[PDB]
């Protein structure tokens, strides 16, 4: 009954804060934004990081990443954004990693909990991801001590 | 003596006294009252609820 075509285990998503996406032939895994926060918003002009891993489903040819755009600011790509034949392209260096980076210069404020659309183009497909903000291995920020009331 | 009216307004809310079953801890006691989603820290006393 539970081992049929509709199976609960097989359709499960990874227990991570990132988002999976299919950019035609490239698999976008663990797509998230790194942005330490202090107040209700991350004000415009602050520089945050966009981190993801691009997986080449095809094993014959190569692919390259171009023109990451979003309506939150301008995204700058630094490094060799080409993914190998049957390899990965790690963009960003997340916590727990002992150099392609995506630098986002904010134009409008962002906050953890909401979704912001990002556009990925490689050479054969343009998709929107709706990237979230993910705090990684950072410790819980201290809370001011409440008084007696 | 045992009989009690279920719908006697005894709970102060933002729009007057209300019956117990219509209210809860999330019912504002005045307009614009800030109610935080507090987490139980698991320790008795010494801030059992924090922001």
């Amino acid at each position: 009954c539970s081992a049929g075509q509709i199976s609960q285990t097989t359709t499960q998503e990874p227990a991570v804060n990132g988002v999976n996406a299919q950019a035609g032939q490239v698999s976008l895994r663990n797509v998230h934004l790194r942005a330490p926060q202090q107040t209700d918003y991350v004000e415009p002009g602050t520089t945050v990081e966009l981190l993801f891993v691009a997986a080449n489903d095809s094993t014959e040819g190569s692919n390259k990443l171009k023109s990451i755009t979003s309506d939150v600011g301008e995204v700058t790509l630094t490094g060799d954004s080409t993914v190998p034949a049957d390899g990965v392209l790690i963009v960003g260096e997340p916590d727990g990693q002992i150099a392609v980076t995506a630098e986002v210069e904010l134009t409008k404020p962002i906050t953890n909990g909401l979704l912001y659309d990002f556009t990925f183009t490689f050479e054969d497909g343009e998709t929107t991801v709706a990237v979230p903000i993910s705090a990684g291995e950072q410790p819980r920020r201290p809370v001011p001590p409440a008084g007696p009331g | 003596g045992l009989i009690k009216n279920p719908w006697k307004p005894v709970v102060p809310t933002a729009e007057g006294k209300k019956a117990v079953l219509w209210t809860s801890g999330w019912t504002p006691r005045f307009k614009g009252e800030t109610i935080y989603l507090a987490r139980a820290t698991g320790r008795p006393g010494e801030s059992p609820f924090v922001k």
Partner: peptide, 25 residues
């Protein structure tokens, strides 16, 4: 029977505004 006050909606909804909080408890 089904509860009359429980129906699905197709409206997308908006992001809630930032809470301010009125004074004078």
């Amino acid at each position: 029977c089904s509860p009359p006050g429980e129906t699905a909606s197709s409206e997308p909804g908006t992001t809630p505004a930032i809470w301010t909080g009125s004074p004078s408890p």
